[PDB]
Amino acid sequence: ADPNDDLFYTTPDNINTYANGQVIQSRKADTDIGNSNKVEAFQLQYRTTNTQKEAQANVATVWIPNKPASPPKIFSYQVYQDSTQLNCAPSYSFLKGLDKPNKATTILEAPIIIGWALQQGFYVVSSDHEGPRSSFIAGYEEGMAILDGIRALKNYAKLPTDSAIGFYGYSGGAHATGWAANLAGSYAPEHNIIGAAYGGLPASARDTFNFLNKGAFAGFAIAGVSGLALAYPDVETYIQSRLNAKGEKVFKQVRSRGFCIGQVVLTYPFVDAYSLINDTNLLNEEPVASTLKSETLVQAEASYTVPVPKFPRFIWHALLDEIVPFHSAATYVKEQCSKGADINWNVYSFAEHISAELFGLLPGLDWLNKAYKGQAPKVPCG
Amino acid sequence: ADPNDDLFYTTPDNINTYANGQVIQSRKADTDIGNSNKVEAFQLQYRTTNTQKEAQANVATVWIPNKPASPPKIFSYQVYQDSTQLNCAPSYSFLKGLDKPNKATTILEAPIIIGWALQQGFYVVSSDHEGPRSSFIAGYEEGMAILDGIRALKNYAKLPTDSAIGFYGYSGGAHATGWAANLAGSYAPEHNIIGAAYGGLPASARDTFNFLNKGAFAGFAIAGVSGLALAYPDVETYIQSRLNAKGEKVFKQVRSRGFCIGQVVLTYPFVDAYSLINDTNLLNEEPVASTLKSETLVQAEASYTVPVPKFPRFIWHALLDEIVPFHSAATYVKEQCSKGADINWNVYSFAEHISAELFGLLPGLDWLNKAYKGQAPKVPCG
Numbered sequence: 035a036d037p038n039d040d041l042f043y044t045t046p047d048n049i050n051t052y053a054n055g056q057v058i059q060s061r062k063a064d065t066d067i068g069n070s071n072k073v074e075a076f077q078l079q080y081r082t083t084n085t086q087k088e089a090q091a092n093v094a095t096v097w098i099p100n101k102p103a104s105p106p107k108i109f110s111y112q113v114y115q116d117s118t119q120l121n122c123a124p125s126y127s128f129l130k131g132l133d134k135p136n137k138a139t140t141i142l143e144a145p146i147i148i149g150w151a152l153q154q155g156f157y158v159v160s161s162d163h164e165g166p167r168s169s170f171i172a173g174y175e176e177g178m179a180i181l182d183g184i185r186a187l188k189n190y191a192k193l194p195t196d197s198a199i200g201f202y203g204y205s206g207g208a209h210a211t212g213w214a215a216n217l218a219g220s221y222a223p224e225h226n227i228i229g230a231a232y233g234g235l236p237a238s239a240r241d242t243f244n245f246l247n248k249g250a251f252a253g254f255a256i257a258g259v260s261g262l263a264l265a266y267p268d269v270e271t272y273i274q275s276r277l278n279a280k281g282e283k284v285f286k287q288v289r290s291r292g293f294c295i296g297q298v299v300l301t302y303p304f305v306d307a308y309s310l311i312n313d314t315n316l317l318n319e320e321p322v323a324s325t326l327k328s329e330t331l332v333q334a335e336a337s338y339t340v341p342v343p344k345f346p347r348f349i350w351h352a353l354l355d356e357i358v359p360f361h362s363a364a365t366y367v368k369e370q371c372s373k374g375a376d377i378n379w380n381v382y383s384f385a386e387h388i389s390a391e392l393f394g395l396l397p398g399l400d401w402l403n404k405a406y407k408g409q410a411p412k413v414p415c416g
Numbered sequence: 417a418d419p420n421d422d423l424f425y426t427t428p429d430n431i432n433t434y435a436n437g438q439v440i441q442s443r444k445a446d447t448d449i450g451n452s453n454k455v456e457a458f459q460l461q462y463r464t465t466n467t468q469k470e471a472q473a474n475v476a477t478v479w480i481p482n483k484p485a486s487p488p489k490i491f492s493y494q495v496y497q498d499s500t501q502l503n504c505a506p507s508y509s510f511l512k513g514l515d516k517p518n519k520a521t522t523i524l525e526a527p528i529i530i531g532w533a534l535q536q537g538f539y540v541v542s543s544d545h546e547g548p549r550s551s552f553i554a555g556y557e558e559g560m561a562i563l564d565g566i567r568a569l570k571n572y573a574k575l576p577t578d579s580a581i582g583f584y585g586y587s588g589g590a591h592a593t594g595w596a597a598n599l600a601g602s603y604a605p606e607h608n609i610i611g612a613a614y615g616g617l618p619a620s621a622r623d624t625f626n627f628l629n630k631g632a633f634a635g636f637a638i639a640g641v642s643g644l645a646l647a648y649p650d651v652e653t654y655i656q657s658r659l660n661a662k663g664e665k666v667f668k669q670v671r672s673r674g675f676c677i678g679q680v681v682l683t684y685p686f687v688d689a690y691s692l693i694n695d696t697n698l699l700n701e702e703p704v705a706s707t708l709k710s711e712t713l714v715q716a717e718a719s720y721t722v723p724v725p726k727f728p729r730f731i732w733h734a735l736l737d738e739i740v741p742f743h744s745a746a747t748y749v750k751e752q753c754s755k756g757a758d759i760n761w762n763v764y765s766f767a768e769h770i771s772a773e774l775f776g777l778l779p780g781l782d783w784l785n786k787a788y789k790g791q792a793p794k795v796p797c798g
Contacts, residue, residue: 069513301774393682
């Protein structure tokens, strides 16, 4: 079934009676990656918490290795869903078959990365990090969803509380991983996190919007505004109020069934987001402006004290990334390092956004493999 | 079964009794794109002709539309296989399941492109253009294999000899498409070609090798060397003779089972191919030097008179292409135009290699759709 027509994606009336990370129900998942590793896969419906601190149900996908490594180890993989529609969700995208509207996102690196993890006997989880509202780039939603998805896996597989946890994500998936890292200490302190490897980090929603708007990848700017609006009802109300006729069409379109990563990129090249409104001060009015100061990891922009995770991290970026700005990510790392972070920082001089994904894969994985053994290299931060 | 263990991929002893394009045998093919489109697909084993003008068997995949357009129309789609190992072949990669080692080459753009064709009621064919020796970048082999694949489809579906034919391919696929075009008038004169759309064309083997070597994508230079040597026994003898111990390991490796596009790219970044050889002057030693003059489309470098196809063409290239050099493709276009070609030339100043594939897709498909209707625009050549 399409997720829009599936009760497994709905929040039951009694959602408040389940704790964060708790499994409401589970079902067998017929996935490509599980079928190709000859492994049992499952969908978990689990309780989590949304941006306004309200209970909601969410879906994650989990793969159980046939020969679990001992002691138990967990691997959390974040997809670059990059879209604001529910049938683009990773869960649905992982299910057997070509014919998923956001298939592109679960079909290139995911099979290698998840296969890699499974071969070494790790438990794997990939959460629907955007949640039931498909709130692309809403960091508090993404962070909590992912940390609760890891909780749901531990619960389901009856794994020790201190089971070592590692993360991988690129671009959209790096925003997601970065926010799980950001919130881990305060929201899920029981997670024993031994490392997170992530690249092409969109550190600042505002900076990434300005870097993308009017460019070839302007679609993702549109999707990001769509996504924030879905996490923040006051922002939805404000944004809807400014949309002109063209803007109303675009925001329906970008939220429509099957409108996923390929549609996003190929429908909106060189679009100017401001042409969808009569409000060239869009980003500079309430509630948008203060929302953006919450939705950044850059302390010099933020309205809160940005957390500084101390566990090993491996972060990489293309110097000439044409999609997600290098400088915001470099600024984040420098800031984090000045406050005692452990960041193994890799600047790829020879790559742009898409090839940085390709060239950071093996370095990221090799490092995470070391981290799981307590062998992450002690290197100067940044 | 793996193509290496499948007799469908072997040449029978009586191959010489079959005509070029004659179907030797056919079988139902359970393909992703067949299933998503709810369409019948088959593998055809057919006779074609190799670089040494000897008969051999090859494989192509065909998709039969549910509601055929009248009069019959054929779409030939060329994959960027980009590897020198039989189990990287398009046919195998098109089959259901993700555990095909070169799966990445048939699950991004292929479903979009082939789907488009089938919805128009077009008969679709994708040949294993590298042939049974996996001779990546051998233009004569690729061209003849493609033109015979189209003959095989005509014969199998019993289509009029003058059914209009269109082509699409990018990068490695554009090399294959370009060489199909190059050889059409002399090799398959009966084909009624209404259009060819191809971008990121490697016009010269020599120039592309020089562009790739020692860089991030040096892997393609190594596979190119492997490929030419697989098409030309005298090149194979020469190269094997020059390989040091490192080189021998590399050429076994680049030809080994499962060593496909991902392994090529990630295994060899920044390799200098000369480190594998005792011959700083390789490109200028025979038989390599003369081979390279046969294996170019650029008349200024070629030792034969390069054909100038007259039918409508749509060619695009990234101005900033970091993989396949713009200048050689632009020179090809300028030369062809001065000799009467019809090339709709499209330069993307905002893109590199990969983003040119993405953003040229819809323009190329839109154009091909006009071409099938006799509506391709009259534009100044080049």
